[PDB]
C-alpha cells in the first residue's frame, strides 16, 4: 500500500523533472543562441513548448493521486484538463509536421525549396495550434468538479446521453492521435529511407555507408520510441472502456505506468530531436 504509492509518486516525479529540464534547456539554447532563424528550429521550439506545457500539468495529477481528491478548484481543474488534452494533440501534430517536412525535404527537393521557408513553417505551426484548439475548447467547457464519496473529482462531464458523447470523445481522440499519426509517420519515414537508399551520394564508400546507416538508425529509433510510448495508454483506454476490470493494485500500477510512458515520450522528445541534431550539437561543442 505505502510502497505502491511511493513508487507511483517517485515515477511521476522523475518523469516531470527530466521532462521540464529537457524542455526548458532546449528552449533556452534556441532562444539564446539559434534565435529561430531557420524553419527546423521553429518546429523544434514548438515541440519543446508543447512538451513543456504537457509536462507542467503532471504534478497536479500527482497531488490528485496522493490526496485522493481535487482541492485546486473548478477553474484550475478546467485549465489542467484543457492543457493536457490540448498539448497532447499539439505535440503529436508537431511530430507529424516534422515527418512531413523531412519527407518533402528528401523526396521532393524542388518543392522543398518552396516548402522549407521560415514563413511557411510559421503558418503551418499556427495552423497546428489552431487545429489543436478544436479539442482544447470543448474539453475546457465540459470539465467540472463533482463530489464523489465526499471527495472532489476533477474529470469530464458529458451531456445526456453520457455514453454516446463519452465514446465519441474516446474514439475521436484514439483515431486522430494514434491511427492517423502512426500511419503518416511510418509511411513518410519509410519512403524517406527508400529515397535515401536511392541517393548516389549516401552510397559508394564505407564512411558514407556508415553515415547512411546512422541516419536510418536515427529514423527507426524515432518511429520505435513514438509507437512504444503511445501504444499502451491508447490500447489500455480502449480495453478499459470495452471491458470492465476489477480494481487491483497491479491495475493501478499499470494505469499510472501507461500514463508515465505517455508523458515519457514528451520527456524524450528533446533528446531525440534537439540533442541528437547536428546543428545543435555543433552549438554545444562550440560553447
Amino acid at each position: 500500500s505505502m510502497i505502491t504509492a511511493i513508487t507511483i509518486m517517485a515515477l511521476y516525479s522523475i518523469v516531470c523533472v527530466v521532462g521540464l529540464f529537457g524542455n526548458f534547456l532546449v528552449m533556452y539554447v534556441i532562444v539564446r543562441y539559434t534565435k529561430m532563424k531557420t524553419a527546423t528550429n521553429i518546429y523544434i521550439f514548438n515541440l519543446a513548448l508543447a512538451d513543456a506545457l504537457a509536462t507542467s500539468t503532471l504534478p497536479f495529477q500527482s497531488v490528485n493521486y496522493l490526496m485522493g481528491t481535487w482541492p485546486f478548484g473548478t477553474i484550475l481543474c478546467k485549465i489542467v484538463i484543457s492543457i493536457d488534452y490540448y498539448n497532447m494533440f499539439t505535440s503529436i501534430f508537431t511530430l507529424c509536421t516534422m515527418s512531413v517536412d523531412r519527407y518533402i525535404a528528401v523526396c521532393h527537393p524542388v518543392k522543398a525549396l518552396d516548402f522549407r521557408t521560415p514563413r511557411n513553417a510559421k503558418i503551418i505551426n499556427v495552423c497546428n495550434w489552431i487545429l489543436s484548439s478544436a479539442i482544447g475548447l470543448p474539453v475546457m467547457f465540459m470539465a467540472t468538479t463533482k463530489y464523489r464519496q465526499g471527495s472532489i473529482d476533477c474529470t469530464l462531464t458529458f451531456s445526456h446521453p453520457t455514453w454516446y458523447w463519452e465514446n465519441l470523445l474516446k474514439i475521436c481522440v484514439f483515431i486522430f492521435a494514434f491511427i492517423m499519426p502512426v500511419l503518416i509517420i511510418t509511411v513518410c519515414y519509410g519512403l524517406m529511407i527508400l529515397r535515401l537508399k536511392s541517393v548516389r551520394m549516401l552510397s559508394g564508400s564505407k564512411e558514407k555507408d556508415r553515415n547512411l546507416r546512422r541516419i536510418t538508425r536515427m529514423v527507426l529509433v524515432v518511429v520505435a520510441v513514438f509507437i512504444v510510448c503511445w501504444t499502451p495508454i491508447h490500447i489500455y483506454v480502449i480495453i478499459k472502456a470495452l471491458v470492465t476490470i476489477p480494481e487491483t493494485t497491479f491495475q493501478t500500477v499499470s494505469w499510472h505506468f501507461c500514463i508515465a510512458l505517455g508523458y515519457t515520450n514528451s520527456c524524450l522528445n528533446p533528446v531525440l530531436y534537439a540533442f541528437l541534431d547536428e546543428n545543435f550539437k555543433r552549438c554545444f561543442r562550440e560553447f
Partner: peptide, 19 residues
Amino acid sequence: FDAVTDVIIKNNLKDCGLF
C-alpha cells in the same frame, strides 16, 4: 541536373540535421 538535385538533397539533409 541529377548532380544539382543531389546537392539540394545534401543541403536539405544538412538543414534537417540528420546528415
